[PDB]
RNA sequence: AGAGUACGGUAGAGGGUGGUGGAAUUUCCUGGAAGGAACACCAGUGGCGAAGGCGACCACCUGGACUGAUACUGACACUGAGGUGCGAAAGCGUGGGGAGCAAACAGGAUUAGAUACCCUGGUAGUCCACGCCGUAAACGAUGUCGACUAGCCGUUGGGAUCCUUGAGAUCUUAGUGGCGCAGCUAACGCGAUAAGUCGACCGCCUGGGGAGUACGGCCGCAAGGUUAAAACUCAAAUGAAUUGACGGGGGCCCGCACA
């Protein structure tokens, strides 16, 4: 998984009436942080496709959570596409 | 409680005289720990508490 | 983290376990590791032939560093010293004592 | 014993014929008393 | 040469019999086979051969004594329990068996299941 | 290892071995000397080895086969190309100036190594007497007389395995496949030689032979009866002789070792 | 409410890298030295993964579900032609290894003959790194997903109820099995893991041969694979089930059938 220090760290800018861990600030961008740091083990273990099928499972679900923000909230979408180093 | 290989005379009650381990069909121990005993068996067997052949 | 040490000696070598242990005890305190058990086994007999002898002695300690006191903890005795066929078997909490 | 080696497709011809007998022994004995 | 103690192999495979008698450190004193007493062919896949193949090294281990022996066991086939009860008839008081049957964990695979 | 594209009819089969961590020019000048070509020719001026002539100008590198500095640690400066052999050479800088060349082992770039009476074995590249090298370990650059320097197992990727030990001698299996008793006073270097992908390169074209100083082989069935025993004949004949040299020695199977003064040193022949 | 995440806790041959092993067997030699390969028991109508698949010991970087709840999202949903990855082993690449067996064979014994099973021998291969093939009795010969309609007996992981000492019942779930009604089925049989009642969607079928074959396209170094026809030809091929017969099918029994 992610680091025990980190998975409780990254929520500190996702707060937005802080008790939310459910809006797509969290399941995009905890999950975007899952994308950006678990690249490491692939370089050593390139013969195990079980771990990047989870990557494509949630980067679609991130894009699915981008897809609902296409219509529900375009303005807070700019906080996602403008930030995080996307695209 | 939490079983290991430091308590020898508990595991030696299941250690065969011919050096082997017993199944659950021979003596009654839990099948929950039958997958955990044999791993702790081969740590006493690896740290030379139990033989590999029944000669020496 | 919690890291359960077992390493072997040759029975003609055990006159300097009092020098073997003390270097590891300062290999851990450079990195803030708390030692919760320091054991010296019984001089027991062997069940198989290891280096074609018929006697040995066992050592037990418990390292609680993070990461840095592992690769030297291996390679002092993995490369060249009197230790053979160990297992490093990390734990998750502390214990008190064994060997009765 | 180990004069021959068995093919790992026939390995479920040895055990899977026998693992039913482990269960079917419970079948015959419970139909024995009744 | 006057010794009183030793060990004893018996090879007990399916076709043939091999008997091997050594001392307790590993120097062979006597030996006989199922092609030892003049058979050479089709019959002696029997324990009757190991009845005969025991006593050609049972009156040949009476060259350097061996009042006591140590039976080591070897091989799967016949003649297993019908050969070490022939040596004790030949003036011996052999005590008890010891077994190292050839057992790998998986090992080299033999000629497989022939039909 | 690269395989060239067929932009011309000569590059179609050139498989090239290129190492990018080899040093880029200026070999170590106080440790080279002049070397002129023979053409395969005697001091009687006679061709005594055939098929030699031409090539590129080359300087001889004074590579140390003795490894005498004992106890002085040498750091490795760089690995260089050596025109004189198929292996690589490594420029070592000892702890008191003192550059030398050795034969480079596999896996060296700026590592530390010291030849002595009891040096570390884990580092591959440490030269050491064959008494205190552990049995079972692969070595290279084995001396054959103490003080003579390394003679055995020093081509590219060459090695020998130290297999047994008794007395003043030591037995080691050679890359040839033959067991060879060697004295244990004489040195050897732990490891295996560097350029082990040298057997993969293809020359590609007839010119690539000609600039290694190698010169064409007319085969003897193409000659006349006066030139070769594979005589003449009408059309393609097939050497009605048994196959034989241009001087009449039989070539397809006939043993030619006649040393006798070193046969006890060879415990088992090529099998 | 569906679906997702913040919090541990185990369970787990997930999977991969590097090592450390043992006995045989094999190969040497005077019990040692040497290296390959699969790891008896633990083994389970057990786990794990979408699937293919996967067990000595050991760390090391890493998956998805379960569950205990507590938090929050506000259908973000499932399915999905094309499209895109990923798929057992013999392979043939591009480099290595090397034990046993063994594809390739030589004879040995055998038959009209072995070109066969049996007998004496061995390279390719399995192994490794990257890469290609994308084949299947890939089978549970059962697409994925949700809902609901009597049960009963083991067994796997949690959790709570339980007089409680567990020798453990009950309950609760998510898996894995047995047997059975309602139910369906041509029957065999399935039977809350449906082969019922349904719903959304997808793939697929239209008599047997010709034929998964030609030709054309695509991929492969090749062997080939994938998509895929008609011309002709036959009135039948096929499915489960039943009676009889047969069997170098088993099991009992009878008779000078065996002395």
User: Is F140 part of any known ligand binding site?
Assistant: no
Could you tell me the distance in Å between the CA of residue A39 and the C1' of nucleotide G88?
A: 30
In the beta sheet, which residues pair with residue E72?
Answer: E9, E98
> Quick count: other Cβ atoms within 10 Å of Cβ F194?
24
> In A1-87, which ranges are continuous DSSP H helix?
4-7, 26-29, 31-37, 40-44, 50-69, 78-81
Provide the greatest CA pair distance for chain C. Answer: 39
| Strand G at less than 7 A from CB of A82 | no
What's the CA gap between D6 and E76, in Å, rounded? 18
How far is C-alpha A59 from the chain's CA centre? 8
Q: Do C49 and B56 touch (CB under 8 A)?
A: yes
Chain C contact for B43 (CB, 8 A cutoff) = yes
Domain of C67?
Answer: 1-92
| Strand G at less than 7 A from CB of C53 | no
What's the CA gap between E92 and A60, in Å, rounded? 83
Name the residue with the least CA to C1' distance from nucleotide G51: A50
Could you tell me the distance in Å between the CA of residue F56 and the C1' of nucleotide G243?
A: 97
- The residue in chain E having the minimum alpha-carbon distance to the alpha carbon of residue B55 is E100
CA separation (Å) from B3 to B15, B41, C61? 15, 10, 19
Answer yes or no: are the C-beta atoms of A20 and A12 closer than 8 Å.
no
The values of phi and psi at residue F235, to 5°, are: 75, -170
Answer yes or no: are the C-beta atoms of F164 and F112 closer than 8 Å.
no
The three-state (H, E, C) secondary structure of chain F, written as one string: CEECCCCCCCCCCCEECCCCCCCCCCCCHHHEEEECCCCCECCCCCECCCCECCCCCEEEECECCCCCCCCCCEEEEEEECCCCCCCCEEEEEECCCCEEEEECECCCCCCEECCCCCCCCCCCCCEEECCCCCCCCEEECEECCCCCCEEECCCCCCCEEEEEEECCEEEEECCCCCEEEEECCCEEEECCECCCCHHHCECCCHHHHHCCCECCCCCHHHCCCCCCCCCCCCCCCCCCCCCECCCCCECCCCCCCCCCCCCCCEEECCC
Chain E contact for B27 (CB, 8 A cutoff) = no
Half-sphere CA count of F25, side-chain side, radius 13 A: 0
Contacts of D13 in chain E (CB under 8 A): none
Q: Determine which of C4, C5, C47, C50 to mutate to test the interface with B (most B C-beta atoms within 10 Å).
A: C47
Answer yes or no: are the C-beta atoms of F98 and F77 closer than 8 Å.
no
Q: Quick check: is C100 in a domain?
A: no
Q: Strands E71-74, E8-11: parallel, antiparallel or unpaired by DSSP?
A: parallel
Can you say whether residue E13 is alpha, beta or left, with left for phi > 0 and alpha for psi between -120 and 50 degrees? Answer: beta
| Strand G at less than 7 A from CB of F2 | no
- Scanning every strand, the nucleotide with its C1' closest to A37's CA turns out to be G62
Answer yes or no: are the C-beta atoms of F70 and F111 closer than 8 Å.
no
Domain of E15?
Answer: 1-115
Resolution, rounded to a tenth of an Å? 2.9
CATH code at A55? 1.10.287.10
Domain of A27?
Answer: 2-87
Q: Quick check: is C63 in a domain?
A: yes
Cα end-to-end span (Å), chain F = 32
CATH code at C55? 3.30.70.60
Backbone gaps in chain C, preceding residues (C–N over 2.5 A): none
- How was it solved? cryo-EM
> Looking at the 3D structure of chain E, how many domains does it have?
1
| Strand G at less than 7 A from CB of C48 | yes
Q: Do E113 and D6 touch (CB under 8 A)?
A: yes
Q: Quick check: is C98 in a domain?
A: no
Answer yes or no: are the C-beta atoms of A23 and A16 closer than 8 Å.
yes
> Looking at the 3D structure of chain C, how many domains does it have?
1
Q: Which residues contact C92 (CB under 8 A, 6 or more apart)?
A: C1, C2
Q: For the residues of E74-93, what is the DSSP string, one character each?
A: E-SSSSSSSSHHHHTTTT--
| Domains delineated in chain B | 1-56 (4.10.640.10)
Q: Do E98 and B55 touch (CB under 8 A)?
A: yes
> Looking at the 3D structure of chain A, how many domains does it have?
1
> Quick count: other Cβ atoms within 10 Å of Cβ E52?
21
Q: Do D4 and E76 touch (CB under 8 A)?
A: no
CATH code at E62? 3.30.420.80
Cα end-to-end span (Å), chain A = 24
The three-state (H, E, C) secondary structure of F33-60, written as one string: EEECCCCCECCCCCECCCCECCCCCEEE
């Amino acid at each position: 998984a992610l680091s025990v220090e980190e998975k409780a760290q990254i929520v500190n800018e996702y707060k937005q009436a802080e008790g939310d861990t459910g809006s797509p600030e969290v399941q995009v961008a905890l999950l975007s942080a899952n994308i950006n740091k678990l690249q490491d083990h692939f370089k050593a273990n390139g013969k195990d496709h079980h771990s990047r099928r989870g990557l494509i499972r949630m980067v679609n679900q991130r894009r699915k959570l981008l897809d609902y923000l296409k219509g529900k909230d375009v303005s807070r979408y700019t906080a996602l596409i403008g930030r995080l180093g996307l695209r | 409680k939490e079983i290991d290989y430091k308590d020898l005379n508990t595991l030696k009650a299941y250690v065969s005289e011919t050096g082997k381990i017993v199944p659950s069909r021979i003596t009654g121990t839990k099948a929950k720990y039958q997958r955990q005993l044999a791993t702790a068996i081969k740590r006493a067997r690896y740290l030379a508490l139990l033989p590999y052949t029944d000669s020496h | 983290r919690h890291y359960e040490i077992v390493f072997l000696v040759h029975p003609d070598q055990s006159e300097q376990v009092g020098g073997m242990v003390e270097r590891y005890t300062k290999a851990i305190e450079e990195d803030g590791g708390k030692i919760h058990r320091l054991e010296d086994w019984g001089r027991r007999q062997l069940a198989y032939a290891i280096n074609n002898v018929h006697k040995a002695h066992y050592v037990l300690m418990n390292v609680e560093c993070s990461a840095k006191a592992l690769a030297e903890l291996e390679d002092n005795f993995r490369a060249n010293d009197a230790v053979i066929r160990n297992l490093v078997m990390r734990r998750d909490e502390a214990v008190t004592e064994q060997s009765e | 014993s180990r004069e021959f080696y068995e093919k790992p497709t026939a390995e479920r011809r040895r055990k899977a014929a026998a693992a039913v007998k482990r269960h079917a022994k419970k079948v015959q004995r419970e139909q024995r008393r009744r | 040469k006057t010794v009183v103690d030793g060990i004893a192999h018996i090879h007990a495979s399916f076709n043939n019999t091999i008997v091997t008698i050594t001392d307790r450190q590993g120097n062979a004193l006597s030996w006989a086979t199922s092609g030892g007493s003049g058979f050479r062919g089709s019959r002696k896949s029997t324990p009757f051969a190991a009845q005969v193949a025991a006593e050609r090294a049972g009156q040949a281990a009476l060259e350097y004594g061996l009042k006591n022996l140590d039976v080591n066991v070897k091989g799967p086939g016949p003649g297993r329990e019908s050969a070490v009860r022939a040596l004790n008839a030949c003036g011996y008081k052999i005590a008890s068996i010891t077994d190292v049957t050839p057992i790998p964990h998986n090992g080299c695979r033999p000629p497989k299941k022939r039909r | 290892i690269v395989k060239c594209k067929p932009t011309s009819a000569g590059r179609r089969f050139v498989v090239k071995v290129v190492n990018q961590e080899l040093h880029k020019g200026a070999p170590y000048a106080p440790l080279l000397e002049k070397k002129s070509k023979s053409g395969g020719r005697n001091n009687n001026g006679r061709i005594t080895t055939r098929h030699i002539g031409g090539g590129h100008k080359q300087h001889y590198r004074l590579v140390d086969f003795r490894r005498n500095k004992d106890g002085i640690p040498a750091i490795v400066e760089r690995v260089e190309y050596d025109p004189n052999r198929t292996a690589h050479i490594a420029l070592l800088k000892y702890a008191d100036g003192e550059r030398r060349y050795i034969i480079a082992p596999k896996g060296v770039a700026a590592g530390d190594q010291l030849i002595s009476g009891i040096g570390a074995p884990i580092k591959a590249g440490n030269s050491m007497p064959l008494r205190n090298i552990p049995v079972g370990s692969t070595v290279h650059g084995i001396e054959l007389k103490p003080g003579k320097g390394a003679q055995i197992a020093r081509s590219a990727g060459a090695s020998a395995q130290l297999v047994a030990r008794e007395g003043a001698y030591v037995t080691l299996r050679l890359r040839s496949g033959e067991m060879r008793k060697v004295l244990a006073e004489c040195r050897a270097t732990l490891g295996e030689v560097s350029n082990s992908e040298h057997s993969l390169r293809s020359l590609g074209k007839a010119g690539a032979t000609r600039w290694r100083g190698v010169r064409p082989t007319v085969r003897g069935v193409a000659m006349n009866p006066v030139d070769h025993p594979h005589g003449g004949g009408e059309g393609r004949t097939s050497a009605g002789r048994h196959p034989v040299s241009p001087w009449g020695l039989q070539t397809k199977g006939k043993k030619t070792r006649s040393n006798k003064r070193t046969d006890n040193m060879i415990v088992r022949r090529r099998k």
